[PDB]
Amino acid sequence: YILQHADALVKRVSKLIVNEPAARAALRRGVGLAPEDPRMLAAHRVVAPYVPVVHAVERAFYAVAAIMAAQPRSARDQRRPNLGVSLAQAVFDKGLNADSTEQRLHLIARQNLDGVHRHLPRLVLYLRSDQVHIDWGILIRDLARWGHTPRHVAREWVQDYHRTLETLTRQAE
């Protein structure tokens, strides 16, 4: 359901990065920190209207908007897959190292909600840095469900990653 507010946030913000600089620059200074942190007080003008009503959903929305605006200029310039499908696409196509990125994904899958946020911006900006595609609404919904799921979303992330890597390798034959 949340995927709806998530898609509205992804659209408006995806337009916001390209058209108005002061807004995305007001968004990127809040990457990876809880909304109570004073560096986030400037991001409420953009994000606060779109969150329904647990902090888990707010942290998902606010954080993905911040990671979304912190894309490098090159990335910003240019079925529904998860972040794991985006990972496997960055392994097979863009040539990222395999033993390390699989290790980093199975490293994310153990954190709690507090830890995922700590680890995610570095990984996502790594992925985004080489034009890997990531559907932000799915990542939002997933990050909102990370709080109440012990591993119910992460397992989906890991399974899809391994599976998509196997299929991408078998299609190359």
- What residue ranges bind another protein (CB under 8 A)? 102-103, 106-107, 110-112, 114-115, 118-119, 122, 150, 155, 158-159, 162-163, 166
Decide if 124 contacts 60 (C-beta within 8 A): no
Report in angstroms how near the CB of residue 113 gets to another protein at its nearest.
10
Shortest distance, position 49 Cβ to another protein, whole Å: 30
Of 13 and 158, which CB lies nearer to another protein in the complex structure?
Answer: 158
User: Following DSSP, what letter does each residue of 7-72 receive, concatenated?
Assistant: HHHHHHHHHHHHH-HHHHHHHHTTTTS-TTSGGGGGGHHHHGGGS---HHHHHHHHHHHHHHHTS-
63 CB contacts (<8 Å, ≥6 apart)? 31, 32, 117, 120, 121, 143
Q: Which is nearer to another protein, 140 or 154 (CB)?
A: 154
Which amino acid type is present at position 5?
Answer: H
* Of residues 4 and 167, the one with the C-beta less far from another protein: 167
- Smaller CB distance to another protein: residue 65 or 108? 108
| Distance in Å, CB of 77 to another protein, minimum | 20
Give the nearest distance from C-beta 50 to another protein in angstroms: 28
**Cβ neighbours for 53, distance < 8 A, ≥ 6 positions apart:** none
